[PDB]
Nucleic acid binder design. Structure first.
Ligand SMILES: Cc1cc2nc3c(=O)[nH]c(=O)nc-3n(C[C@H](O)[C@H](O)[C@H](O)COP(=O)(O)OP(=O)(O)OC[C@H]3O[C@@H](n4cnc5c(N)ncnc54)[C@H](O)[C@@H]3O)c2cc1C
Length: 456
DNA sequence: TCGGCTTCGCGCA
DNA sequence: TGCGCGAAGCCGAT
């Protein structure tokens, strides 16, 4: 569909049809940004070829009721900033409320749209909406991967067992799919309040707020400023100050040596391709660049691969055969501790290290990457069943992580509990052959006491 | 039919 | 802290 700096492998057709004489509609769901967005860039190119304007539509669903105010405010503030950014480029943005399968189909007919484009997400609920829209529209429907550097359907045609099998496939396609982004051209032709939906949503989620003993909210909203501009500042400071020591200190939660980009990456407020572009050009420690590029390229995009080819990604069925046989054999082992969902959520376990990891999650909304493995693994050790641990870990991860409800969350929890993208280890009680992590193992790798005291 | 597995624990400089 | 080894099942290059 036209374009010079435009790889057609990034786009794929979801429904054929006659191209109408109306504007091109970019159904924005996962990549909530204006810059470095192929889906918006593909939409603009199609609109330019048909001499029609491009418009952006965003449907706010009832899914926010399953999470907290921390995610709702982070997303909505960025949407307000994005609204002004698209206005400066003469691109109007429409915000609907309701079921996307019903609202997008009504919007496509009332607005007389000619072409429908959306960004890619391997989540189950995104696929259900697409099927409902396909059955309710008669215009062409395209789908652009704006979240991965190499399109998810292109990087592999099957579920990848581990990273060392997916790594050569991804890095071979980098010289083709790693490139600069063209500027978003403004519109030539021109043709609900987000402040009201913020107040309405906040009031709804107020009774479910995480509070301390004295009714004070646990969440500290100053650690991450939401928005496209604020995302770029974080990436700049990571390259300048932290990328040099990332390789040595990534597994030390006492040092803030991570990139902190996951909240922005999840909501799409910054493109992972942009970060990789800048990281590649940066002159820093060769070991740290390789370690960082491995996380944001290999392990990020294999989480999309995991969820795209396994629709039961959030279930015990998705675990490999050896892990399922190992976890089943130990179902009758006596657990040294059994905690309920309520006890885990309030950080009332016997392990001060686990409790502190939970307190980082409750208060900041971003648990450290190393402690997240220890966090989910201990849930498996102190729960009734592998199913209950998966359910509890997914519940606490989506409710409280800013980067939650993400394919990284499900694949990461799958790695911790079911050994997805991992291998077998020493046979143990309860967890079987799943990789084990101990408090004493953390003590020799980082100052565990300093971490505990920072979060009570 | 081997070789090596993100993110392991453990003994030893 | 940094390093080598143990302990485990399997993909994939042949
Ligand atoms: C049990 C568990 C739950 C997690 N929950 C989430 C989640 O809800 N949402 C989320 O985005 N990530 C989650 N992570 C993945 C990973 O821990 C986060 O990407 C990271 O901790 C966020 O901090 P950062 O962006 O500064 O990390 P960095 O070290 O700076 O990583 C750079 C980027 O690489 C990607 N990445 C890094 N580590 C991983 C990983 N292990 N798996 C997949 N991608 C990775 C992310 O996009 C991340 O932003 C989870 C991991 C585990 C083990």
């Amino acid at each position: 569909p036209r374009g010079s700096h435009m790889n057609p492998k990034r786009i794929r057709a979801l429904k054929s049809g006659k191209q109408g004489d109306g504007p091109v509609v970019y159904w924005m769901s996962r990549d909530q940004r204006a810059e470095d967005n192929w889906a918006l860039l593909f939409s603009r190119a199609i609109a330019k070829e048909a001499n029609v304007p491009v418009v952006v539509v965003f449907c706010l669903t009832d899914e926010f009721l399953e999470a907290g105010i921390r995610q709702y405010e982070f997303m909505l503030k960025g949407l307000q900033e994005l609204e002004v950014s698209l206005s400066r480029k003469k691109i109007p943005s429409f915000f609907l409320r309701g079921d996307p399968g019903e609202k997008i189909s009504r919007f496509v007919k009332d607005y007389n749209a000619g072409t429908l484009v959306t960004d890619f997400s391997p989540l189950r609920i995104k696929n259900q909406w697409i099927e409902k829209v396909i059955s309710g529209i008669s215009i062409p429907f395209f789908e652009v991967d704006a979240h991965n550097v190499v399109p998810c359907w292109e990087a592999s045609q099957k579920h990848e067992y581990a990273a060392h099998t997916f790594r050569p496939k991804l890095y071979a396609l980098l010289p083709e799919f790693l490139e600069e982004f063209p500027e978003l051209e403004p519109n030539s032709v021109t043709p609900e309040t987000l402040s009201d939906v913020l107040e309405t949503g906040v009031k709804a989620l107020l009774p479910e707020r995480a509070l301390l003993k004295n009714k004070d909210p646990l969440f500290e909203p100053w650690h991450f400023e939401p928005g496209e501009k604020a995302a770029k500042k974080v990436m700049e400071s990571f390259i300048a100050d932290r990328l040099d020591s990332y390789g040595a200190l990534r597994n030390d939660p006492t040092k803030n040596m991570l990139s902190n980009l996951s909240p922005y990456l999840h909501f799409g407020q910054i493109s992972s391709q942009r970060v990789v572009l800048e990281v590649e050009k940066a002159e820093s420690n060769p070991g740290s660049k390789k370690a960082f590029l491995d996380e944001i390229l290999i392990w990020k995009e294999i989480s999309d691969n995991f969820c795209y080819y396994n629709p039961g990604y959030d279930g015990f069925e998705s675990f490999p055969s050896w892990a399922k046989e190992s976890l089943n054999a130990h179902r009758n082992d006596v657990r040294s501790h059994i905690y309920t969902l309520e006890e885990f959520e309030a950080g009332k376990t016997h392990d001060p290290l686990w409790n502190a990891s939970q307190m980082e999650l409750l208060s900041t909304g971003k648990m450290h990457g190393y402690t997240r493995m220890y966090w989910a693994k201990k849930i498996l050790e102190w729960s009734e069943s592998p199913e209950k641990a998966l359910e509890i870990a997914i519940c606490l991860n989506d409710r409280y992580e800013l980067d939650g409800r993400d394919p990284n969350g499900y694949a990461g929890i799958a790695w911790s509990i079911g050994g997805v993208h991992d291998r077998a280890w020493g046979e143990r009680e309860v967890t079987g052959k799943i990789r084990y992590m101990s408090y004493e193992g953390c003590k020799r790798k980082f100052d565990v006491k300093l971490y505990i005291e920072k979060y009570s």
